Each structure stands twice: as structure tokens, then as C-alpha cells.
């Protein structure tokens, strides 16, 4: 529902990289290049950004008030 | 009645009036108490609550909003007032003496102490009044009368209601008005979502 | 002196509901309303 804070297997902080990864994908980069541009060497930490689903948006659509 | 402390007991502050904006018997429980209406520089004048009136101007008072007036009178000078100008300050000695002098000049006999004693209980008993009767319907109707509909979560419900009314109504002008209102509501919702 | 404040369903407006009273919002009028969080010492361990 939200990007984790750390890679389950490794432990490297990955939570602070979701917005950057999205920006890099948006401008021109491709995933395979954006991932190493952020500095994710081990394939264990890449699954965090590739596989992660972003449901928090759908959750925010149900605004309590206004 | 010659003391200010006893006279402040029935003073209707600005925080208490917010809980009876639509309660019935407003002309019975309110009529009799005194308020510190602000005239405007820091001088205040106490006036008697003769009755209740309704102004054509709609104003918001903090969270809620009411357009009802208050026909007050200070000895002989009377005019329309509003519930927003009332202050929460208690009757000072100077204002108490000014009110006593105004009453004596106007010839209105000062209300007896027992009168205030038996009237102050009216607000107390009305506050804890159980809403078992069919008053909530009138309260909600009055609130929605001035309170605009789109706010805030009823956008989809309002749109569905408008569509249903338009479909039911076979008139052309009513159908066009309903369609226009629905389109405006949809556009406003789209704008809010984009923002 | 706690009148058991509630939260309207769609208005998301507070209401004062006491015992032996109908469950409705002060405005509009709906039949759903949730409670407000407790005031107790809700303490978690970030474990
Ligand atoms: Zn990893
Ligand atoms: Zn209601």
C-alpha cells in the first residue's frame, strides 16, 4: 500500500527512493537504467521498486471530509 | 435588582446562542434575558429582548450561520440588531449604572429580582432538554435552507438526486435547469479533483 | 459532563447525542455516524 522503508532481504533504505524512481521513469529513463541510476546494485533491493504496487492513491481517493 | 453580579446570570453569551439557532420556543425562553450588544468605541449598552425578527442578510458566525435578527430596545431607542455583534463580556459597573439610568429615564419598571431568579432556570432546563419530539427534522430543514448543498461529501448523492428529478420531470424548462445544474456540479467536482 | 460526541457519516461534522435520542446528524440528516478516538494513553512500541 506504501513503499516499504527498508529492503526486506538487504536492509538498505529504499523508502526515500519512490518519488525519485518515478521522476526518473517519467523524464526519459527506463527501469533497468533508472534502478542503477538510483544506486540499487543488488537484485534483492530492485524488487522493491519494480514489484511495489501503489495503492495509497486509491486509498486517498476516499477523502473523509471535503 | 441593583447588583451587576446577579444581573449577569441571565446574560446570554455568544457561545450559548449557537446551540439554539433552530430550537423551537425561541421566542419564549429567550424573551426576558439581557445581552451586551456591542454598538461601537468600547462602550456597551444593555438592551431588553422584546422579541425575535428575521433579517434578509445572511451572515456566517464562526462555524454555523444564521440570518435571524433580534429586536432589542434600550429604554426608548430601538432598532434591528444581529447576533454577531453580541459580546461575551459581563455587565460592568459603568454599563450597569448606564442601563439603570436609561431604564429610569424611559420609565420602564425594573424587573423584580424574583423574576430574574425564575427566568434564569429557563435556559438551564432548556439546555438539558431531550430531543425526543419531531424537532430534528425542522432543524435539519432550516440548516439546509441556507447552507448550500454541494458541500462537501454529498456531491455524488446530489448529482444522482438532480438526475432523478430531471428524469421524473416531464417539463422542458425544468429538464433544462436540472441538466444545467448537473453539468455545473460535475464541472465543479472535476475541478476540485484536479486541484 | 460528557455528552458522548459522535461524528456524522458523510457530513463529517460533530454531533452531541445523548441516551434515548435518535441517531441523526444535526444537519442534512443521516443514519450513520462513527465514534471519536479515545483519550486514553494509546502507546505503541515501534517493533
Ligand atoms: Zn534488496
Ligand atoms: Zn443528521
UniProtKB/Swiss-Prot annotation, chain B:
Q: Where is the Plus3 domain?
A: 1-128
Reported effect, residue 73 to E: Loss of binding to single-stranded DNA
Per the record, what is the consequence of mutating residue 78 to A? Reduced binding to single-stranded DNA
Q: Which segments does the entry list as coiled coil? A: 170-195
* GO biological processes: blastocyst growth; chromatin organization; endodermal cell fate commitment; negative regulation of transcription by RNA polymerase II; stem cell population maintenance; transcription elongation by RNA polymerase II; Wnt signaling pathway
A GO cellular component term found in this entry reads: Cdc73/Paf1 complex
Tell me where on the tree of life, at the top rank, the source sits.
Answer: Eukaryota
Upon changing residue 79 to E, the result is: Loss of binding to single-stranded DNA
Which keywords does this chain's UniProt record carry?
Activator, Coiled coil, DNA-binding, Nucleus, Phosphoprotein, Transcription, Transcription regulation, Wnt signaling pathway
**Subcellular localization, per the record?**
Nucleus, Nucleoplasm
Extract the GO molecular function terms from the UniProt entry. RNA binding; single-stranded DNA binding
Q: Per the entry's comment, what about the domains?
A: The Plus3 domain mediates single-stranded DNA-binding.
The protein's assembly and partners: Component of the PAF1 complex, which consists of CDC73, PAF1, LEO1, CTR9, RTF1 and SKIC8; the association of RTF1 appears to be less stable than that of other subunits. At least in HeLa cells a N-terminal shorter form of RTF1 is also found in the complex. The PAF1 complex interacts with PHF5A.
Role, per record: Component of the PAF1 complex (PAF1C) which has multiple functions during transcription by RNA polymerase II and is implicated in regulation of development and maintenance of embryonic stem cell pluripotency. PAF1C associates with RNA polymerase II through interaction with POLR2A CTD non-phosphorylated and 'Ser-2'- and 'Ser-5'-phosphorylated forms and is involved in transcriptional elongation, acting both independently and synergistically with TCEA1 and in cooperation with the DSIF complex and HTATSF1. PAF1C is required for transcription of Hox and Wnt target genes.
The molecule here is called RNA polymerase-associated protein RTF1 homolog
Its gene name is: RTF1
Amino acid at each position: 500500500m506504501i513503499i516499504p522503508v527498508r529492503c526486506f532481504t538487504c536492509g538498505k533504505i529504499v523508502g526515500n527512493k519512490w518519488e525519485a524512481y518515478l521522476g526518473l521513469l517519467q523524464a526519459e529513463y527506463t527501469e533497468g537504467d533508472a534502478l542503477d541510476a538510483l544506486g540499487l546494485k543488488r537484485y534483492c533491493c530492485r524488487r522493491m521498486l519494480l514489484a511495489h504496487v501503489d495503492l495509497i492513491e486509491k486509498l486517498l481517493n476516499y477523502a473523509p471530509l471535503e | 435588582v441593583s447588583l451587576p453580579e446577579e444581573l449577569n446570570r441571565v446574560r446570554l453569551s455568544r457561545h450559548k446562542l449557537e446551540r439554539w439557532c433552530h430550537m423551537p420556543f425561541f421566542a419564549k425562553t429567550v424573551t426576558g434575558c439581557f445581552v451586551r450588544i456591542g454598538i461601537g468605541k468600547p462602550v456597551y449598552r444593555v438592551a431588553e429582548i422584546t422579541g425575535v425578527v428575521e433579517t434578509a442578510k445572511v451572515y456566517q458566525l464562526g462555524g454555523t450561520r444564521t440570518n435571524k435578527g433580534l429586536q432589542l430596545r434600550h429604554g426608548n431607542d430601538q432598532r434591528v440588531f444581529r447576533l454577531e455583534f453580541v459580546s461575551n463580556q459581563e455587565f460592568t459597573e459603568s454599563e450597569f449604572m448606564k442601563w439603570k439610568e436609561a431604564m429610569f429615564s424611559a420609565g420602564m419598571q425594573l424587573p423584580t429580582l424574583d423574576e430574574i431568579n425564575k427566568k434564569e432556570l429557563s435556559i438551564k432546563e432548556a439546555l438539558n432538554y431531550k430531543f425526543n419530539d419531531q424537532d430534528i427534522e425542522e432543524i435539519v430543514k432550516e440548516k439546509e435552507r441556507f447552507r448550500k448543498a454541494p458541500p462537501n461529501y454529498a456531491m455524488k448523492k446530489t448529482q444522482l438526486l438532480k438526475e432523478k428529478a430531471m428524469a421524473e420531470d416531464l417539463g422542458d424548462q425544468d429538464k433544462a435547469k436540472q441538466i444545467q445544474d448537473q453539468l455545473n456540479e460535475l464541472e465543479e467536482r472535476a475541478e476540485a479533483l484536479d486541484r | 459532563q460528557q455528552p458522548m460526541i459522535y461524528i456524522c457519516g458523510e457530513c463529517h461534522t460533530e454531533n452531541e447525542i445523548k441516551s434515548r435520542d435518535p441517531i441523526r446528524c444535526r444537519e442534512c440528516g443521516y443514519r450513520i455516524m462513527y465514534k471519536k478516538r479515545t483519550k486514553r494513553l494509546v502507546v505503541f512500541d515501534a517493533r
